[PDB]
Design an enzyme around this catalytic site. Structure first.
Site, PDB file in Angstrom:
ATOM      1  N   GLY A  28       0.777  -1.232   0.000  1.00 63.76           N
ATOM      2  CA  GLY A  28       0.000   0.000   0.000  1.00 63.76           C
ATOM      3  C   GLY A  28       0.808   1.282   0.000  1.00 63.76           C
ATOM      4  O   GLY A  28       1.970   1.307   0.419  1.00 63.76           O
ATOM      5  N   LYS A  45      -4.221   5.079   3.840  1.00 60.50           N
ATOM      6  CA  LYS A  45      -3.485   4.034   3.114  1.00 60.50           C
ATOM      7  C   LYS A  45      -4.371   3.444   2.040  1.00 60.50           C
ATOM      8  O   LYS A  45      -5.489   2.990   2.341  1.00 60.50           O
ATOM      9  CB  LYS A  45      -3.009   2.914   4.046  1.00 60.50           C
ATOM     10  CG  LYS A  45      -2.294   1.759   3.272  1.00 60.50           C
ATOM     11  CD  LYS A  45      -1.459   0.858   4.138  1.00 60.50           C
ATOM     12  CE  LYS A  45      -2.319   0.007   5.037  1.00 60.50           C
ATOM     13  NZ  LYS A  45      -1.516  -0.898   5.884  1.00 60.50           N
ATOM     14  N   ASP A 160       1.033  -2.039  11.925  1.00 60.79           N
ATOM     15  CA  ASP A 160       1.206  -3.227  11.070  1.00 60.79           C
ATOM     16  C   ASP A 160       1.429  -4.534  11.811  1.00 60.79           C
ATOM     17  O   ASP A 160       2.094  -5.424  11.298  1.00 60.79           O
ATOM     18  CB  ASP A 160       2.361  -2.965  10.080  1.00 60.79           C
ATOM     19  CG  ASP A 160       2.174  -1.728   9.213  1.00 60.79           C
ATOM     20  OD1 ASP A 160       1.006  -1.252   9.090  1.00 60.79           O
ATOM     21  OD2 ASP A 160       3.189  -1.220   8.672  1.00 60.79           O
TER      22      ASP A 160
HETATM   23  C1  39P Z   1       5.297  11.055   8.721  1.00 57.85           C
HETATM   24  C2  39P Z   1       4.295  11.232   9.841  1.00 57.85           C
HETATM   25  C3  39P Z   1       4.520  10.115  10.860  1.00 57.85           C
HETATM   26  N1  39P Z   1       3.843   8.910  10.344  1.00 57.85           N
HETATM   27  C4  39P Z   1       2.555   8.516  10.554  1.00 57.85           C
HETATM   28  O1  39P Z   1       1.718   9.131  11.256  1.00 57.85           O
HETATM   29  C5  39P Z   1       2.147   7.245   9.874  1.00 57.85           C
HETATM   30  C6  39P Z   1       2.860   6.586   8.934  1.00 57.85           C
HETATM   31  N2  39P Z   1       2.194   5.483   8.542  1.00 57.85           N
HETATM   32  N3  39P Z   1       2.544   4.469   7.570  1.00 57.85           N
HETATM   33  C7  39P Z   1       1.747   3.423   7.303  1.00 57.85           C
HETATM   34  N4  39P Z   1       0.526   3.298   7.985  1.00 57.85           N
HETATM   35  C8  39P Z   1       0.162   4.215   8.893  1.00 57.85           C
HETATM   36  N5  39P Z   1      -1.004   4.054   9.511  1.00 57.85           N
HETATM   37  C9  39P Z   1      -1.813   2.990   9.147  1.00 57.85           C
HETATM   38  C10 39P Z   1      -1.581   1.776   9.792  1.00 57.85           C
HETATM   39  C11 39P Z   1      -2.349   0.683   9.477  1.00 57.85           C
HETATM   40  C12 39P Z   1      -2.047  -0.553  10.193  1.00 57.85           C
HETATM   41  O2  39P Z   1      -1.243  -0.467  11.159  1.00 57.85           O
HETATM   42  N6  39P Z   1      -2.639  -1.697   9.786  1.00 57.85           N
HETATM   43  C13 39P Z   1      -2.631  -2.836  10.521  1.00 57.85           C
HETATM   44  C14 39P Z   1      -2.808  -4.184   9.980  1.00 57.85           C
HETATM   45  C15 39P Z   1      -2.744  -5.023  10.970  1.00 57.85           C
HETATM   46  O3  39P Z   1      -2.539  -4.340  12.127  1.00 57.85           O
HETATM   47  N7  39P Z   1      -2.468  -2.964  11.841  1.00 57.85           N
HETATM   48  C16 39P Z   1      -3.386   0.778   8.496  1.00 57.85           C
HETATM   49  C17 39P Z   1      -3.642   1.987   7.833  1.00 57.85           C
HETATM   50  C18 39P Z   1      -2.866   3.120   8.139  1.00 57.85           C
HETATM   51  C19 39P Z   1      -3.166   4.418   7.404  1.00 57.85           C
HETATM   52  C20 39P Z   1       1.027   5.406   9.225  1.00 57.85           C
HETATM   53  C21 39P Z   1       0.923   6.478  10.085  1.00 57.85           C
HETATM   54  C22 39P Z   1      -0.198   6.824  11.052  1.00 57.85           C
END
Ligand code: 39P
Length: 335
Positions: A28, A45, A160
């Site tokens: 993604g 995402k 994740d």
């Molecule tokens: C540069 C500013 C600092 N960075 C961030 O705030 C940040 C970077 N990210 N990168 C990927 N996913 C994120 N979040 C995210 C995480 C997941 C996720 O963790 N999925 C799962 C799947 C299983 O368990 N958790 C799903 C969708 C999303 C948008 C995310 C966040 C919040």
């Protein structure tokens, strides 16, 4: 009522999102956006080809099931899940929304020799979130600084968790690099140990540039397997591959981490044990004296039982896609 969607192209990928999400900026594939409903910044995402392979289709369903069932302060939460699709037949894209954090542990730590209280606080929150995740019978499997998000005051969220499967490598437990027949939840504790060592010294503990180098870097610190661990190897060829490894004694850690808090050194010794059976768990690590100033057994919750019978299923792409669509349709945003 279906909100109005708008379309745009960012770095050769088409993003189609409700008008609620404004000013999409690549981070993604992930975009930071402004949530017009709350005035807060969000991370959106867009899953890559979610239903174009059985691996992707099941991982898409898994992500949504993990996110809808896991609620804890140190674990990322789902704010929204949407699709521009108006029916199951046209369902090919899925977008997931979470709060946007201040930064990922990496950028904060880039060759930084952090203070002991800062390390204590960061590691305590990782272990608090891992205790919860591990209690639901989930293993993160790919814990690293880039999936540990921190706000401006150092409040941490694990991203994740439970997604990856052994399909960096600097944070990977030696039993995975050696491809042992089975592994346990402490595969994540090894990763915590590597991150903690790095926060204390400002250096990657095991920065191998290839697979062979990686194993050499790990085994020169923790030593090659002893007689007791060797006996736990079910097959003769695996047993013979393990003996073909050079032979290295276990190093003393007080010497490696010179100047570190001795309780920090003692905890690292319990996390970086080669034998997975003797490695400290997240719940045991929380009770370690290093975290005396944060530990509270009344505020380290466990998770509700998680039905993951789907993990043993071999279904078609269309079945994984229909199960995911039911989870998208039934989603209720948090208050
Ligand atoms: C540069 C500013 C600092 N960075 C961030 O705030 C940040 C970077 N990210 N990168 C990927 N996913 C994120 N979040 C995210 C995480 C997941 C996720 O963790 N999925 C799962 C799947 C299983 O368990 N958790 C799903 C969708 C999303 C948008 C995310 C966040 C919040």
């Amino acid at each position: 009522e279906r909100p109005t969607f708008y379309r745009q192209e960012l770095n050769k990928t088409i993003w189609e999102v409700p008008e609620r999400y404004q000013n999409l900026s690549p981070v993604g594939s992930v975009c930071a956006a402004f949530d017009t409903k709350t005035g807060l910044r969000v991370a959106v995402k867009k899953l890559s080809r979610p239903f174009q392979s059985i691996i992707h289709a099941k991982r898409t369903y898994r992500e949504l099931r993990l996110l809808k069932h896991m609620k804890h302060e140190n674990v990322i939460g789902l704010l929204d899940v949407f699709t521009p699709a108006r029916s199951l037949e046209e369902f090919n894209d899925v977008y997931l929304v979470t709060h946007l954090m201040g930064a990922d542990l990496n950028n904060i730590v880039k060759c930084q020799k952090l203070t002991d209280d800062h390390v204590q606080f960061l590691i305590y929150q990782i272990l608090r979130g891992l205790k919860y995740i591990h209690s639901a019978d989930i293993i993160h499997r790919d814990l690293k600084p880039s999936n540990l998000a921190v706000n401006e005051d150092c409040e941490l969220k694990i991203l994740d968790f439970g997604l990856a499967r052994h399909t960096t490598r600097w944070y990977r437990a030696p039993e995975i690099m050696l491809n042992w027949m089975h592994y346990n939840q402490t595969v994540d504790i090894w990763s915590v140990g590597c991150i903690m060592a790095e926060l204390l010294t400002g250096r990657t503990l095991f920065p191998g540039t290839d697979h062979i180098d990686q194993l050499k870097l790990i085994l020169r610190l923790v030593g090659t397997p002893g007689a007791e661990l060797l006996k736990k190897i079910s097959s003769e060829s695996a047993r013979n591959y393990i003996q073909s490894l050079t032979q290295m004694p276990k190093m003393n850690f007080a010497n490696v981490f010179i100047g570190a808090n001795p309780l920090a050194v003692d905890l690292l010794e319990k996390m970086l044990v080669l034998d997975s059976d003797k490695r400290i768990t997240a719940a045991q690590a929380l009770a370690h004296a290093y975290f005396a100033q944060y530990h509270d057994p009344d505020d380290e919750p466990v998770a509700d039982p998680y039905d993951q019978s789907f993990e043993s299923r071999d279904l078609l792409i269309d079945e994984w896609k229909s199960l995911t669509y039911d989870e998208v349709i039934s989603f209720v945003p948090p208050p």
